[PDB]
């Protein structure tokens, strides 16, 4: 059955969603899970939203990712309208019409990080490491928790992901490369790929490593 979560809404507007979910007996939860089917996002008129964690995780889990307007229009027409008419089209970072949410729904058989091992390394802010890890895992990557734990082999593609400005004023995220054999990329590599549901090239996200 349907199971909704909401993102980017004023607890006012959350009020309307709660009233609507109560009216229709639709599961509404405050935390997104494997079972969530709909992530209801605040959008402008063209169904373009901001990127919140729930946004990424809705895309990563191939969920319906849908504008708040699906709820308000549905109330207005007293009928469960069609998600397709309200699917989020893009976000204010990666493009107003990149259609990630659709691609992710359509690509569960060819997940963008299939074949990758990813280590989410060093401090992060605003997104618990294990949610970043869940996000890559959803997208098909196998999750590695310590550098010394990358599986070796030429069939393995390791990647280290870091958020440089969560680090202490010391530039130690350039010395990760002497500790393992992988490319080292910013967290925006993940976030952009996930949003676009397309694996981006590392190139513009690589962090140079001291030898």
């Amino acid at each position: 059955r349907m199971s909704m979560v909401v993102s980017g809404l004023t607890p006012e507007e959350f009020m309307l969603v709660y009233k609507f979910a109560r009216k229709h007996h639709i599961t509404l939860t405050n935390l997104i899970t494997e079972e969530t089917t709909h992530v209801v996002m605040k959008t402008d008129a063209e169904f373009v939203c901001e990127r919140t964690l729930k946004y990424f995780l809705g895309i990563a889990g191939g969920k319906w990712v849908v504008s708040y307007f699906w709820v308000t229009q549905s109330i207005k027409e007293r009928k469960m309208l069609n998600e397709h008419d309200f699917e989020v089209r893009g976000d204010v970072v990666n493009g107003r019409n990149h259609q990630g949410p659709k691609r992710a729904r359509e690509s569960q058989d060819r997940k963008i990080f299939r074949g990758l091992e990813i280590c989410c390394y060093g401090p992060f802010t605003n997104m618990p490491t294990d949610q970043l890890e869940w996000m890559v895992q959803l997208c098909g990557a196998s999750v590695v928790k310590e550098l010394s734990s990358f599986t070796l082999g030429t069939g393995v593609h390791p990647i280290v992901v870091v958020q440089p400005d969560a680090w202490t004023e010391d530039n130690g995220f350039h010395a990760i490369g002497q500790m393992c054999e992988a490319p080292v990329v910013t967290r925006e590599w993940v976030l952009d790929s996930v949003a676009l549901y397309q694996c981006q090239e590392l190139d513009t996200y690589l962090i140079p490593q001291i030898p």
Binding site: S7, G8, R51, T52, L53, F56, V92, V93, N126, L191
Partner: peptide, 6 residues
């Protein structure tokens, strides 16, 4: 309240 990622 929910963090945004720009």
């Amino acid at each position: 309240r929910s963090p945004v990622f720009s």
